[PDB]
Swiss-Prot record:
Subunit text: The mature envelope protein (Env) consists of a homotrimer of non-covalently associated gp120-gp41 heterodimers. The resulting complex protrudes from the virus surface as a spike. There seems to be as few as 10 spikes on the average virion. Interacts with host CD4, CCR5 and CXCR4. Gp120 also interacts with the C-type lectins CD209/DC-SIGN and CLEC4M/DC-SIGNR (collectively referred to as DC-SIGN(R)). Gp120 and gp41 interact with GalCer.
Bilayer topology annotation: Peripheral membrane protein; Single-pass type I membrane protein
Role of this protein: Attaches the virus to the host lymphoid cell by binding to the primary receptor CD4. This interaction induces a structural rearrangement creating a high affinity binding site for a chemokine coreceptor like CXCR4 and/or CCR5. Acts as a ligand for CD209/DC-SIGN and CLEC4M/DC-SIGNR, which are respectively found on dendritic cells (DCs), and on endothelial cells of liver sinusoids and lymph node sinuses. These interactions allow capture of viral particles at mucosal surfaces by these cells and subsequent transmission to permissive cells.
Protein's name according to its UniProt entry: Surface protein gp120
Protein localization: Virion membrane; Host cell membrane; Host endosome membrane
Length: 14
């Protein structure tokens, strides 16, 4: 899995 949340960067991927 890989979850990433930056300045409005919805990079949520399970």
């Amino acid at each position: 899995k890989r979850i990433h949340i930056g300045p409005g960067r919805a990079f949520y991927t399970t």
